[PDB]
Subunit: 255 residues, 4 copies
């Protein structure tokens, strides 16, 4: 582990499930003081939780003031809350398309905007944004999702450049990870039959050079590294946690 | 020139000045039937113009519907309309930040969403999105702008993947170009002295390996190429027109 | 076409077949004075040919002096000559691995090294290096090939930076193109049966968003553009001619 | 620290000084059994050393064979040995240019080629190649160096794709780091005045958003992370340790 994360105040958005939850759980294991900002209840959890809608600037600011005055500081902000729906730019309603941008992008902008003034009062604060391997190689009929993930990269670089050297800001670009959302994605394609869903997830896993999809904990490992002093000279980049997906051309060669 | 562009219907957003105007004029010179969609009147111009605010999806749709009925088709759409304001995430109001995203990203989404259905009714239609070199290397205190330009790359890949092989979609990533916006950016730093401004612009020029800033017609050449059949197997990419800016590290070496 | 290429002296290496030949043929159509530098005879061709081994620095220099003194100048150098063989870093002999680097990299370095002193005496000389989409997304068991293609990108950037603004240097990154080499690649996998080879090539084509492999002429179009004045502010980049291959993740989504 | 590294056999090339020495010392601190393969003796060090010229494949193979017989396995290989000389493609002799490629690229190919067969006999082996920020943004008159660093990225992807999921392979892309090589690079520009040298180094430091150059231990932190199980789903990528250098455009904006 990273001993410097102990006792540090860490905020994770959208951590009541999946990747966000594995991230919150890793920081708890690192001895940090973790606060989950999300609309859903994480139920039984080793970390604190605050009902908060990341797209509601008034709720976000208030939740961040509560954390700072209650804890005394904020060292790490992990922007993770996000969503996805499918459809061509032609069929998906404009409302649904803007909503995806609002959650996946504006939610990061709001949390970052209000947390930064408090974070820079701490020693070496760090922000980690969860993007996607789709900030590079993309999927079909995911216009809004793909756009928001590219936008997150731009926000990450600009925050990194605007606040260096006091604060660092990096992104994590995961490929297919074993989460409920990915489970839903499979289902929306092969039905509710959980065994077919397993064959589907397996097909995706085999497209990754590592021959399997990733685990939430593996994304959390990258987040913990980037948030620690071990990444002291690392800022403005995306650490790809994709089992080699982004460097693989789907073209066979003689074996 | 690119002969296949003659007589084809080409829509260019924000073509009343700068890069947009240079793009419209190049297509006119190619013999294309050009329509400018912007809020400002380009005065005496060889291309057609329709008053249109790209952040208004209803006006965008109406404008595009009208063009199709009046001209019979739409083969090329060039999304160029954009704006830039400066400020740290903490100082720029949320409204202004959001307004930059509205024009720079949603404007491209709206124009694309409504033109595509018509475009796929023509032979090998093409869309070219003007992004920026800042889709890779960025400037300070330009959070909203930088974010919007990264987002445009995502939208570009999505459209390219969603509609290939029927329609192609690419972007152009310009570095510093001689336009009113850029002259204004310099003025915001050095004042109205045409001598002190030329100095600031010459400074930026010397930062580019080509030792000068680009000309609008140079960006227009890249747009015409990508919109033409000379780029029939090119889709989903960004053609950098940056005089080498994006590949230069600002670290001296012996000489 | 690009009227500025007329009467210009253009050198193309490895142009007795495939991509290199389509490139030579395009410049001839542009009215340029084309000279093919290759070890094989292009037979009946509308352009000049000089028996030359690109890996032989003495042969390269001599061939370039012959061209310059005979023609009076050199405006464009297209480095294309290359090769490929398959095998894990473990099985392929070291001799075969170095040979691939020698042809795909050192051959570009030699031709560039000797042509540059003559080119910079011309107005706006241009160099175009043929790399590959594998300078980004790669194939398996192609260690030496993939490495050489990444190296070509580095050589391109450095030549661009070292000689700007007098001379420009760019690369073209093609994906699967209909060439004899690609035909051989298929065969080495599915046998000599030309019909199975067709089903194989078709499978590759369908992996590209454009749903087909590229044509040599389409690569030549990109080369002609980059070599012309239309690309006057373009230097140090790679123009991807990949039908969208490099931006596509091999992950299905709900349709 | 990364507990899984304790007791594992780690080979580091060019670990007698600078980044290489910092990497060896970090692994020693992790409890690993470290062996340095270089031509220079690291003097009194906690890690083991074997006299070895990485451009000699026979000596590399012999050294690696010996390590495996003496230690029982090899879990990590860190390719770091490298050199840098400056000069325009026209002035640097072909021999020196080629020598840079021999050490910087072939040295990595040789060490990897001979260690891999042994490495796949251990549990989750890992290779980390030290590339450079110049695999993206480059410096002038560093043709061979820049070319070699791009090539290293290609070799890295290939190894990653060829041996996944058994073995992982990633690279680290360091910007300016405080090492003897860098101090020497500065001296080549400003002389031996420790005051004038510190000035040159401070100049380079201010070019990085972090406002300082990196420390060798910071590069070592990234290497240890990638070599550990904390990066089990990370392969084929380059982790940039550049203090933000690669995402900064050298163009001023109002403030």
């Amino acid at each position: 582990g990273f001993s410097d994360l102990r006792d540090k105040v860490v905020i994770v958005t959208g951590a009541s499930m999946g990747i966000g939850r594995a991230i919150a759980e890793r920081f708890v294991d690192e001895g940090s003081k973790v606060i989950d900002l999300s609309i859903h209840d994480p139920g039984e959890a080793k970390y604190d939780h605050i009902e908060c809608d990341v797209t509601n600037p008034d709720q976000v600011k208030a939740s961040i003031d509560h954390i700072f005055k209650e804890y005394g500081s904020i060292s790490v902000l992990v922007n993770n809350a996000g969503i996805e729906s499918y459809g061509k730019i032609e069929s998906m309603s404009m409302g649904e398309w803007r909503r995806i941008i609002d959650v996946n992008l504006f939610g990061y902008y709001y949390a970052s905007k209000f947390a930064i003034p408090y974070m820079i009062r701490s020693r070496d604060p760090s922000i980690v944004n969860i993007s996607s391997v789709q900030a590079s190689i993309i999927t079909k009929n995911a216009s809004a999702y793909v756009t928001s993930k590219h936008a997150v990269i731009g926000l990450t670089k600009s925050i990194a450049l605007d606040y260096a050297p006091l604060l660092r800001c990096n992104a994590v670009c995961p490929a297919t990870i074993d989460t409920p959302l990915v489970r839903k994605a499979a289902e929306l394609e092969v039905g509710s039959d959980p065994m077919r869903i397993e064959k589907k997830i397996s097909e995706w896993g085999h497209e990754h050079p590592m021959q399997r999809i990733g685990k939430p904990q593996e994304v959390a490992s990258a987040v913990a590294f980037l948030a620690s002093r071990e990444a002291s000279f690392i800022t403005g980049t995306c650490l790809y946690v994709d089992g080699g997906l982004s460097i693989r051309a789907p073209i066979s060669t003689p074996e």
